[PDB]
């Protein structure tokens, strides 16, 4: 299993066009917004479920393409699985104490569990094996503008709060942005790939997942979130050749100056890319 | 003849309190050259209200510190302080010499008990 | 290894975004702040660690570029390796107490262990003194403005343990900083470089590290960081030429006049650098 | 024995930021404070050591400029050297039956050793050398106002020793002072200088050292330390011309009127100086 040859950086842009980007738990499909400014926030973790979903949808249990996270599942289940597979007695709260078989759970999972070939089956709140730092990472997704939503008092009673309402009908607060574009940043590290055996196949699958994400997520509040763009930057060597932030600066996004009034469509916004230095090559069709 | 938990005489109580502040401090800060005893024994017996007020600041600080670490004693000591300070009505400005004798007994008595275990 | 011949002072300036720069051991994992005023803080130790790791990475463990504080390693074996190459065996209190043999392991450290030649060391003993003092030193970093940390929760589709969680999807927790800007100070001593032999090459490498350091340490909890500015002051003599405090005053930071409300980008601020006294020369990053 | 011709007195102001100026052996390593009020304290002995260090650094072993109490000097051998340089076989405590012999030792060691010449010395052990008072004296440094020390927790990710819970994260702690301002008083007496030979070049050297004290003592534990103000009072005759307490009253420091929260910079204070009585000359070196 070959390790990738270069460092990669990418920017993902998806619509919240007359829809909801992500539900804020306490208010159903309320958008996570900066309470000080109201601009749109999306959990970094937002994309991961969708990723796994597309994995399960296209590979559908292919040996080498198992998934770790499963809806309504128990988190330690996949930990247990990876230890079992490697003839270890599960210790899901610690590294597998026989460290050559911690490497076997790691290998086995970074093989079967594509998503663990991709991401750390490790700790921010609870641990698994730990140690297996993720070779791919991406940050909190954010809205391009202060997008304090236009509230959509949906005509339904099936919400966290029940009411005597069911002349007005029962209501649960869901929201849509007249239009908003959400932005995400991500990274790919060769050195950790070397450790985990992340492959080009994996990369392509990743691309595909990225494209197909939102096909699995739609609702009245969700509205439209099309995978508008996915720009990928490739480094020419093992180690990068430019600051990350510099790269992101190349991806200039703003409202279409020809557009007037509050935005309602992606046409209200323009996406442009400056030329990256020779140390980087940019692909822009995903 | 030994420690009496029921003496309820003010200078006896002040002696007990002193003794246990010494013990708590000990556990707080190992390796000190000099103990609070060495520093304040005389003063405490001469000016109760003066010093006693002062010491409890540091004791508060310390018990604040000590809750982070899993180790405990110090909850037993905080209860022991809270019993004696509830029995003491008020802090005298000063004590008659004869009373300063009784303060020594309450201290020694209490110490021995804590010396055990 | 020839010693540097000049006194150096430097200033660095770096960003943070939607992350936890430095977790607090005590307050759960809350970012470290000053309780009186709410300004943020970052320990120097963190910086040191990061630098170490970068060096180790880049240099690939080549000859004369070893590190004595190896990650998750028994450092009594790293001081054993320092001593046994000098026919000596582990001692606390000092490098092996007989001063010539102390100096042989010291030397056989300094010659090759970059980290010791740079930052100095002790094998930590209660007498907390002697061994070797670092020619390079740095202070605490502090936020230019007060910050507003917050806990953040997610709707995880899975549970840690047997639970009643799954109406709303399973919970999570994080802590983040919306945005912040930090500054730091440091010093380099000729005399101590003369004692350790800290050479110019080292200096160069050091610069290089500083600039590039951030890129190699992507993970889930940190979010994003970036080095923004670096300025170097060079004295023209073995000893000093001016008061340090004065020097530090030449650089000034202020909010961009157009920016209003809570800051959210490096553009919200403005920077300035005055001229330096004749006894010292100024040159920007690296 | 040429000596200064006037009586001197002075006051000094210095500042600390995010550091530990002087630790307490009886309080773990807590900064020294006044329990009853909570003001800070700094021993004179510390300052003296600093001065000696500076001198040593500067002069570089020039005759008439040695330091007697070097950091690890064997004091009875150093008295024996002063003894045997004056042809004496070592003997205890008091000056010999012929006090003159140790007085020669006194003469010799005053001649050569600057710090004895300055600060005096008990200079007496199981090898006597005499006794001295020294023309120069200093008092305790006191914080201008209450100070509230903090302490911080740190983690060694690597460990020195083997651990049973395994690598393990092992924590120590630091004590820190956010900010503080200090004041110091001192005296110089002509009659004793007449007895020791304390000369004027000595005095200028002394002042020079005192201004540049902190520049060379950068360290991990100590934060940013600096000297701010220096005022010198010189009398017009071999003896006094005014009461000392009156002179020290001419200098007054008060909170800068624009400063209202807890002090965090030297700009939060205002420093003022009055006029000098007829018999005294006041000049300001800082």
**C161 contact residues in A (CB cutoff 8 A):** 74, 76
Structure tokens at D69: 């109490």
**Cα(A110)–Cα(A198) distance, integer angstroms:** 8
Give the closest residue to A242 by CA, choosing from A210, A274, A272, A270. Answer: A274
Buried b (16+ CB within 10 A) or exposed e, C205-222: bbeebbebbbbeebebeb
Q: Residue A230's CB: how many other CB atoms inside 10 A? A: 21
Give the closest residue to C82 by CA, choosing from C106, C51, C64. Answer: C106
**Cα(B108)–Cα(B94) distance, integer angstroms:** 20
**Cα(A51)–Cα(A37) distance, integer angstroms:** 30
A252, burial (CB in 10 Å: exposed 0-12, middle 13-18, buried 19+):
exposed
**C162 contact residues in A (CB cutoff 8 A):** 74
Q: What is the rounded (10 degree) CA torsion for C160, C164, C168, C170?
A: 0
Compute the count of residue pairs across chains C and D with CB atoms less than 8 Å apart. Answer: 70
With contact defined as beta carbons under 8 Å apart, do C169 and C155 qualify? yes
**Cα(C110)–Cα(D281) distance, integer angstroms:** 53
Q: What is the DSSP string of C55-71?
A: HHHHHTT-TT-B-SS-T
How close C167 comes to chain D (CA, Å)?
38
Give me the phi and psi of B13, to 5 degrees please. -60, -45
Rounded to the nearest 10 degrees, the angle between the axes of helix B10-28 and helix B36-46 is 160
Tokens 């930057």 found at: A233
Beta bridge partner(s), residue C174: C152
**Cα(C155)–Cα(C167) distance, integer angstroms:** 11
With contact defined as beta carbons under 8 Å apart, do A275 and A43 qualify? no
Give the closest residue to A225 by CA, choosing from A180, A264, A169, A259. Answer: A180
Would strands C136-138 and C174-188 be described as parallel, antiparallel, or unpaired?
Answer: antiparallel
Whole-angstrom CA distances from A245 to A61, A124, A137, A253, C17 are 37, 25, 15, 15, 12
Are residues A125 and C264, on separate chains, in Cβ contact within 8 Å? no
Give the closest residue to B51 by CA, choosing from B93, B106, B8, B109. Answer: B93
Q: Which of A26, A46, A125, A195 to probe the C interface (max C CBs under 10 A)?
A: A125
Would strands C158-159 and A73-74 be described as parallel, antiparallel, or unpaired?
Answer: parallel
What Rg do the C-alpha atoms of chain A give, in angstroms?
A: 21
Chains touching chain A, criterion 3+ CB pairs below 8 Å = C
- Please state how this structure was obtained: cryo-EM
Q: Strand, helix or coil at C88?
A: coil
Are residues C219 and A71, on separate chains, in Cβ contact within 8 Å? no
**Cα(A211)–Cα(A203) distance, integer angstroms:** 13
**Cα(A199)–Cα(D267) distance, integer angstroms:** 59
Are residues A243 and C262, on separate chains, in Cβ contact within 8 Å? no
Would strands A251-255 and A280-283 be described as parallel, antiparallel, or unpaired?
Answer: unpaired
Q: Strand, helix or coil at C255?
A: strand
Alpha helices in chain A (DSSP H): 46-58, 76-85, 99-112, 114-118, 190-196, 200-212, 244-250
Please indicate whether chains D and C are in contact, defined as at least 3 beta carbon pairs under 8 Å: yes
Whole-angstrom CA distances from D181 to C266, D39, D117, D254 are 33, 10, 31, 12
- Contacts for D44 with CB less than 8 Å, ≥ 6 apart: D138, D139, D140, D141
Structure tokens at D86: 């004056």
With contact defined as beta carbons under 8 Å apart, do A72 and C158 qualify? yes
With contact defined as beta carbons under 8 Å apart, do B9 and B47 qualify? no
Q: Which chain B residue shows the shortest CA-CA distance from D153? A: B68
- Contacts for B50 with CB less than 8 Å, ≥ 6 apart: B43, B93
Chains touching chain B, criterion 3+ CB pairs below 8 Å = D
Would strands A141-143 and A41-42 be described as parallel, antiparallel, or unpaired?
Answer: antiparallel
**Cα(A41)–Cα(A100) distance, integer angstroms:** 41
Beta bridge partner(s), residue C138: C186
Longest dimension (CA), chain C: 72
- Within an 8 Å CB–CB cutoff, is residue D260 touching chain C? no
Are residues A71 and C157, on separate chains, in Cβ contact within 8 Å? yes
Structure tokens at B27: 């556990």
**Cα(C234)–Cα(A119) distance, integer angstroms:** 45
Q: Residue A209's CB: how many other CB atoms inside 10 A? A: 23
Q: Residue D261's CB: how many other CB atoms inside 10 A? A: 8
**Cα(A284)–Cα(A280) distance, integer angstroms:** 13
Are residues D218 and C137, on separate chains, in Cβ contact within 8 Å? yes
Longest dimension (CA), chain D: 75
With contact defined as beta carbons under 8 Å apart, do D30 and D173 qualify? no
Tokens 């290998």 found at: A107
Residues in chain A: 286
Helix, strand, coil in percent for chain C, rounding step 5: 25, 25, 45
Structure tokens at B46: 């001469």
**Cα(A84)–Cα(A71) distance, integer angstroms:** 21
- Within an 8 Å CB–CB cutoff, is residue B38 touching chain D? no
- The region that residue D20 occupies, defined by phi over 0 for left and psi between -120 and 50 for alpha, beta otherwise, is beta
**Cα(D245)–Cα(D25) distance, integer angstroms:** 32
Tokens 């809806």 found at: A71
Are residues A124 and C154, on separate chains, in Cβ contact within 8 Å? no
How close A262 comes to chain C (CA, Å)?
22
Residues in chain D: 286
Q: What is the DSSP letter of A220?
A: T
Give me the phi and psi of D26, to 5 degrees please. -95, -5
Are residues D26 and B54, on separate chains, in Cβ contact within 8 Å? no
Whole-angstrom CA distances from A253 to A183, A257, C80, D77 are 10, 11, 57, 78
**Cα(B98)–Cα(B103) distance, integer angstroms:** 10
H/E run at residue B54: helix B48-66
Please write down the HEC assignment for all residues of D74-123: CHHHHHHHHHHHCCCCCCCCCCCCCHHHHHHHHHHHHHHEHHHHHHCECC
Q: What is the rounded (10 degree) CA torsion for C193, C194, C195, C196?
A: 50
Are residues D220 and C44, on separate chains, in Cβ contact within 8 Å? yes
With contact defined as beta carbons under 8 Å apart, do A267 and A32 qualify? no
Q: Which of D36, D149, D152 to probe the B interface (max B CBs under 10 A)?
A: D36
Q: How many Å from the N-terminal Cα to the C-terminal Cα in chain C?
A: 22
Are residues D218 and C34, on separate chains, in Cβ contact within 8 Å? no
Q: Which of D152, D161, D162, D219 to probe the C interface (max C CBs under 10 A)?
A: D152
Rounded to the nearest 10 degrees, the angle between the axes of helix B100-115 and helix B36-46 is 150
Structure tokens at D275: 């006029």
Give me the phi and psi of C85, to 5 degrees please. -60, -25
Question: Across the interface, which of D26, D27, D36 has its CB nearest the CB of B54?
Answer: D36
Q: How many CA atoms lie within 13 A of C198 on its CB side?
A: 30
Rounded to the nearest 10 degrees, the angle between the axes of helix B10-28 and helix B48-66 is 40
Question: Across the interface, which of C75, C140, C245 has its CB nearest the CB of D159?
Answer: C75
Q: What is the DSSP string of chain D?
A: -----S-EEEEEEEEEEEE-SSB-TTSTTPBPB-TTT--BEE-HHHHHHHHHHHHHHHH-S-TT-B-SS-TT--HHHHHHHHHHHTTPPP--SSPPSSHHHHHHHHHHHHHHBHHHHHH-B--BSSSB---B--SEEE--EEESS----EEEEEEESSBSS--TT----EEEEEEEEEEEEEEEEEEE-HHHHHHHT--HHHHHHHHHHHHTSGGG---SSS-EEEEEEEEEEEESSSS-SS-HHHHHHTEEEEE-TT--SS--SGGGEEEEE-PPPTTEEEEE--
**Cα(A68)–Cα(A62) distance, integer angstroms:** 13
With contact defined as beta carbons under 8 Å apart, do C179 and C223 qualify? no
**Cα(D44)–Cα(D50) distance, integer angstroms:** 10
Sign of CA dihedral A95, A97, A99, A105: negative
Give the closest residue to C104 by CA, choosing from C96, C112, C114. Answer: C96
**Cα(B55)–Cα(B62) distance, integer angstroms:** 11
With contact defined as beta carbons under 8 Å apart, do A63 and A122 qualify? no
How close C133 comes to chain D (CA, Å)?
8
Structure tokens at D144: 């201008």
Strands (E), chain C: 8-19, 41-42, 120-121, 132-133, 136-138, 141-143, 150-152, 158-159, 174-188, 227-235, 251-255, 269-273, 280-284
Question: Across the interface, which of C75, C243, C244 has its CB nearest the CB of D160?
Answer: C75
**B29 contact residues in D (CB cutoff 8 A):** 26-28
With contact defined as beta carbons under 8 Å apart, do D174 and D223 qualify? no
Sign of CA dihedral D124, D129, D131, D134: negative
Q: Which of B29, B60, B67 to probe the D interface (max D CBs under 10 A)?
A: B29
**Cα(D53)–Cα(D160) distance, integer angstroms:** 32
**Cα(B20)–Cα(B17) distance, integer angstroms:** 5
**Cα(C102)–Cα(C84) distance, integer angstroms:** 12
Tell me how many degrees the CA angle C60-C65-C69 measures, rounded to the nearest 5.
95
With contact defined as beta carbons under 8 Å apart, do C8 and C238 qualify? no
Question: Across the interface, which of C76, C137, C139 has its CB nearest the CB of D160?
Answer: C76
Whole-angstrom CA distances from A121 to A93, A131, A167, B81, C6 are 12, 8, 51, 49, 49
What Rg do the C-alpha atoms of chain B give, in angstroms?
A: 14
Are residues B33 and D26, on separate chains, in Cβ contact within 8 Å? yes
- The region that residue D54 occupies, defined by phi over 0 for left and psi between -120 and 50 for alpha, beta otherwise, is alpha
**Cα(D162)–Cα(D160) distance, integer angstroms:** 7
Are residues C137 and D18, on separate chains, in Cβ contact within 8 Å? no
Resolution reached, in Å?
Answer: 2.8
Please indicate whether chains B and A are in contact, defined as at least 3 beta carbon pairs under 8 Å: no
Are residues D158 and C72, on separate chains, in Cβ contact within 8 Å? yes
With contact defined as beta carbons under 8 Å apart, do A20 and A247 qualify? no
């Amino acid at each position: 299993m070959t390790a990738i040859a270069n460092r990669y950086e990418f920017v993902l842009l998806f619509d919240v066009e007359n829809g909801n980007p992500n539900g804020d738990p306490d208010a159903g499909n309320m958008p996570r917004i900066d309470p000080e400014t109201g601009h749109g926030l999306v959990t970094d973790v937002c994309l991961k479920r969708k990723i796994r979903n597309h994995v399960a949808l296209t590979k559908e249990g292919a040996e080498r393409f198992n998934i770790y996270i499963q809806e309504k599942a128990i988190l330690n289940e996949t930990h247990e699985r990876a230890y079992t597979a490697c003839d270890l007695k599960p210790e899901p709260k610690k590294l597998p104490k026989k460290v050559e078989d911690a490497k076997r759970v790691t290998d086995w999972m970074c093989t079967n569990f594509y998503d663990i070939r991709t991401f750390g089956a490790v700790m921010t709140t609870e641990v698994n094996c730990g140690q297996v730092r993720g070779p791919v990472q991406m940050a909190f997704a954010r809205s391009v503008e202060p997008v304090v939503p236009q509230e959509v008092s949906i005509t339904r009673m099936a919400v966290t709060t029940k009411a005597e309402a069911e002349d007005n009908r029962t209501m649960g607060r869901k929201h849509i942005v007249p239009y908003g574009l959400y932005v995400a940043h991500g990274f790919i590290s060769a050195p950790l790939a070397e450790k985990t055996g992340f492959s080009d196949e994996d990369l392509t699958l990743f691309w595909d997942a990225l494209v197909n994400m939102f096909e699995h997520d739609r609702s009245a509040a969700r509205g439209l979130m099309s995978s508008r763009k996915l720009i990928v930057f490739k480094h020419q060597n093992r180690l990068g050749n430019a600051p990350a932030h510099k790269l992101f600066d190349l991806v200039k996004v703003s409202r279409a100056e020809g557009s007037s009034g509050p935005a309602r469509s992606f046409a209200d916004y323009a996406v442009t890319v400056g030329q990256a230095p020779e140390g980087v090559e940019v692909k822009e069709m995903l | 003849v030994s420690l009496d938990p029921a003496r309820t005489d003010r200078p006896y109580l002040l002696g007990r309190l002193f003794a246990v502040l010494e013990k708590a401090q000990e556990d707080a800060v190992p390796g000190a050259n000099a103990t609070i005893k060495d520093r304040y024994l005389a003063s405490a017996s001469a000016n109760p209200g003066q010093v006693f007020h002062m010491l409890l600041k540091n004791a508060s600080n310390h018990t604040a510190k000590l809750r982070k670490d899993p180790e405990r004693k110090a909850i037993h000591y905080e209860i022991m302080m809270q019993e004696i300070i509830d029995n003491i009505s008020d802090f005298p400005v000063t004590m008659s010499s004869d009373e300063q004798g009784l303060f020594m007994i309450g201290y020694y008595h209490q110490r021995k008990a804590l010396f055990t275990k």
